[PDB]
């Protein structure tokens, strides 16, 4: 049994659907979230992955 550690090596793709920008926008509430994350002025306003290669060194 793993110690009360909440996050495990779950797939990035699986995570993206739950909090993906595409997913975030469809809900009426989700579009609202973007409103705020832009009015504050954040830059990385999601956690996503990309179907090519989710990294640039």
């Amino acid at each position: 049994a793993a110690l009360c550690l909440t996050k495990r090596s779950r797939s990035r793709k699986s995570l993206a659907r739950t909090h993906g920008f595409r997913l975030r926008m469809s809900t009426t509430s989700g579009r609202a979230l973007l409103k705020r994350r832009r009015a504050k002025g954040r830059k990385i306003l999601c956690t996503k992955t990309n179907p090519s290669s989710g990294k640039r060194a």
Binding site: S52, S53, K55, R56, A57
Partner: protein, 92 residues
Amino acid sequence: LKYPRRILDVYQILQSPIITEAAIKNIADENSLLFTVDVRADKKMIREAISNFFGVKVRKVNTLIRPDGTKKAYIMLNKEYNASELAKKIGI
């Protein structure tokens, strides 16, 4: 009608050669030589921008994305054409 996998302008397809000692070894080794292509390139649009800019028929285009974003294209020229003597007019 036939279109290219994408509209990259063709000329913009190749950017610069690679002057590393390893690429020199490949020129002198396989009838290959290395290019550095922008990311939206193919084996069609690179395979058809050397057979129509150097006048040399090409055999393979093994291209690879590179860990920082740009792309890098080993091209194997068909044996009848020889690598180094072609690169000499290019300056390598």
